């Protein structure tokens, strides 16, 4: 019949996993006890994004809005434009499309309009330098997120173009049982509709924390000015630690609010990057949900990923349980033979997923 | 707590600053002969890794992950099985069980490249039942044969080409692209006759939920008043309202003289004015080329031979020729469409 889920929790993943598996799902009891029950506006918009990139899918929402039944179709893709509501930035909608784009009949060329940054969701640079490289490791050779216009909150006004030119049968089998070596730290400090001094004040703050390290540090100052600087003033920074040996990356990001010191934000994000590195074994905590899914939809082979003791949190468990409910796959965790650290190896057998929408 | 929040939880800023005053804790982080052999080595290595890991897992853990490996003698229980299968069971006829991938479960339009078998006597007709054998499944469908018209559109064909492939669209369980198949028209022994029973061979190229097959529709009118380039045409349209919809449309004569629908004439209804690149004759016929959509019939009749008592006289929807014979109906024919010998008188001019 239907695989049943509860609550708004993991809304995008459950919809995304259903699309990849082809198994219909039902999500019920979404915010039943709230004063405003049911789906949020950005969730309804996200479903409108799903139907625009697939064909034959049936999405029926209850009269009260607290239950959703989804019967996935085939991933088709194509060229389209999506108007992101102010409640969520573009990254909230770009991120799920990364899971589906490489397995589409036609190339994904989606134009996203709206706010381009937030405190809780993925930023433009996080996708470009933090998630897309992981896709490249798995066989997605060509993927691009062009920033035509930046939009800071609250009035937004940004524009970004997602283009995934690589269509593949399925992600390759992963094999990473080591701790990648960080060779350098890079990043982008950006600002919209404000003086150029602010972006420089970040890099001074970020460099203050990272100068003690033994590697090179080079942070970009990407100041946005003119018609393409959006409609509101805003600034933010994104730092990326890079391992060129196998092209792995760890990143941290945050934006600035009204009245906040640019130096403090540069310091805070620099501290968070080090914390993320300490909590990571092969991928960052914010990249882990992306990598695991590509393992699940791989070929009928055993892929191996090294993870840290800290990465196994409440978020990690709910991901694995949701995967099993959909794909019936079980993640097998084994200790490493080392004693310097407490890392495990997460071994997953792929379901033999194949891109059957692509014409041959 | 939840994946909707992409950013992970971090400790308080001042705590992290105190924690990361010293960065020592993280300072630790900072030939085969032929190409063919190289590939085979890659496959063998991965297969080796599979064997090593499964050995490490427990026997119960191993079964839980990989499942019942081939070579295992297994007992599989089924429910809601038809009673006719148990009753009309013949041990001579084998029971073959095949697992299905997620795509096999879905139903939709299957796009395939199909050809009449060289030893089959007759060509196949559109919307004519054909028993297909895709993967593990056998079923009867109504396919539509199509052509690309130099890669511009999907135009419906009447029959399969005599000695080549043609695109075919039929509704049935979806299968992965590049899966070959074969087609038969008759499976019952009573209708077998003496001819070769393998009708069509092909390969599935794409799977979709919808298709846009289209059929050429030509509107025909005739001239009744001619002034050099300009001419007035009749019988193409019924009312001036229809003409206004097609004003500016491209038209031509049988002779190949191109023209345009200029204006609709007020009197009589349906008559209109057109201009041609050269003077047309009264004997000429003007044609407007247009395209009308065609729909695939959603007909699905799986071949359940084992359920039947006989198991060799399964019969489904019959062919058009057979249907006509049963009800004694003459094959439809248009006298104008028939071909006749044309003798041309020598052309002379004043």
């Amino acid at each position: 019949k239907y695989t049943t889920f509860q609550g708004s929790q993991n809304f995008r993943l459950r919809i995304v996993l259903a699309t990849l598996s082809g198994k219909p799902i039902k999500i019920e009891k979404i915010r039943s006890g709230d004063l405003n029950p049911g789906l949020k506006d950005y969730e309804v918009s996200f479903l409108r994004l799903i139907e625009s990139v697939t064909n034959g899918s049936v999405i029926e929402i209850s009269y009260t809005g607290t239950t959703v039944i989804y019967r996935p179709g085939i991933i088709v893709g194509g060229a389209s434009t999506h108007i992101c509501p102010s409640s969520k930035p573009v990254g909230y909608f770009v991120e799920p499309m990364l899971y589906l784009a490489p397995f589409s009949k036609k190339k994904f060329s989606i134009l996203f309009k709206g706010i381009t940054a937030s405190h809780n969701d993925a930023g433009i640079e996080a996708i470009k330098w933090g998630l897309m490289p992981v896709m490249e490791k798995f066989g997605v050779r060509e993927c691009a997120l062009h920033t035509l216009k930046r939009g800071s909150p609250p009035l937004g006004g940004g524009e970004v173009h997602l283009v995934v030119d690589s269509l593949i049968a399925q992600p390759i089998t992963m094999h990473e049982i080591d701790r990648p070596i960080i060779s350098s730290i890079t990043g982008v400090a950006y600002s919209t509709r404000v003086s150029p001094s602010l972006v420089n004040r970040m890099i001074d703050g970020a460099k203050k924390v990272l100068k003690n390290l033994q590697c090179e540090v080079n942070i970009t100052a990407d100041v946005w000015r003119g018609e393409n600087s959006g409609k509101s003033p805003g600034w933010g920074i994104t730092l990326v630690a890079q391992s060129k040996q196998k092209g792995w990356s760890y990143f941290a990001e945050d934006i600035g609010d009204a009245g906040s010191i640019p130096e403090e934000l540069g310091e805070k994000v620099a501290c968070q990057l080090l914390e993320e590195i300490s909590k990571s074994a092969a991928v960052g905590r914010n990249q882990l949900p992306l990598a695991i899914v590509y393992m699940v939809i791989g070929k009928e082979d055993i892929g191996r990923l090294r993870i840290n003791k800290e990465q196994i949190d409440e978020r990690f468990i709910i991901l694995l349980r949701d995967i099993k409910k959909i794909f019936n796959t079980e993640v097998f965790l084994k200790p490493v033979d080392e004693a310097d650290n407490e890392d495990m190896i997460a071994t997953i057998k792929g379901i033999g997923f194949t891109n059957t929408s692509k014409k041959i | 707590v939840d994946l909707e929040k992409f950013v992970p939880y971090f400790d308080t800023f001042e705590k992290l600053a105190k924690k990361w005053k010293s960065v020592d804790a993280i300072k630790e982080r900072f030939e085969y002969d032929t190409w063919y052999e190289l590939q085979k080595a890659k496959i063998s290595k991965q297969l080796e890794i599979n064997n090593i890991e499964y050995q490490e897992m427990t026997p119960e853990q191993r079964q839980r992950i990989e499942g019942f490996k081939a070579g295992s003698y297994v007992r599989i229980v089924f429910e809601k099985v038809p009673m006719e299968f148990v009753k009309n069971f013949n041990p001579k006829f084998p029971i073959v069980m095949g697992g299905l991938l997620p795509t096999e479960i879905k139903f939709g339009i299957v796009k395939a490249r199909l050809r009449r078998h060289r030893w089959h006597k007759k060509i196949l007709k559109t919307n004519d039942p054909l028993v297909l054998s895709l993967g593990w499944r056998r079923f009867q469908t109504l396919p539509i044969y199509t052509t690309t018209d130099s890669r511009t559109r999907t135009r419906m064909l009447k029959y399969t080409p005599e000695h080549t492939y043609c695109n075919a669209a039929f509704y049935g369980p979806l299968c992965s692209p590049n899966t070959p198949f074969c087609g038969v028209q008759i499976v019952a022994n009573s209708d077998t006759g003496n001819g070769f029973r393998i009708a069509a061979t092909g390969i599935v190229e794409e799977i979709d939920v919808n298709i846009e097959i289209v059929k050429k529709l030509k509107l025909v009118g005739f001239p009744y008043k001619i002034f050099k380039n300009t001419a007035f045409i009749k019988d193409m349209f019924s009312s001036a309202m229809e003409v206004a919809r097609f004003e500016g449309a491209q038209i031509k004569t049988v002779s190949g003289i191109r023209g345009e629908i200029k204006r609709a004439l007020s009197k009589p209804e349906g008559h209109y004015r057109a201009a041609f690149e050269d003077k047309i004759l009264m004997s000429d016929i003007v044609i407007l080329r247009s395209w009308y959509p065609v729909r695939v019939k959603k007909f699905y009749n799986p071949v359940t031979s084992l359920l039947l008592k006989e198991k060799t006289e399964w019969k489904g929807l019959r062919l058009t020729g057979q249907i006509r014979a049963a009800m004694n109906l003459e094959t439809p024919s248009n006298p104008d469409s028939a071909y006749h010998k044309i003798e041309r008188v020598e052309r002379h001019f004043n």
Partner: peptide, 14 residues
């Protein structure tokens, strides 16, 4: 041009 090649659709009954 949007409706030409679609079969599904989000059926909202709210």
């Amino acid at each position: 041009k949007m409706m030409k090649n679609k079969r599904g659709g989000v059926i909202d009954k709210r």
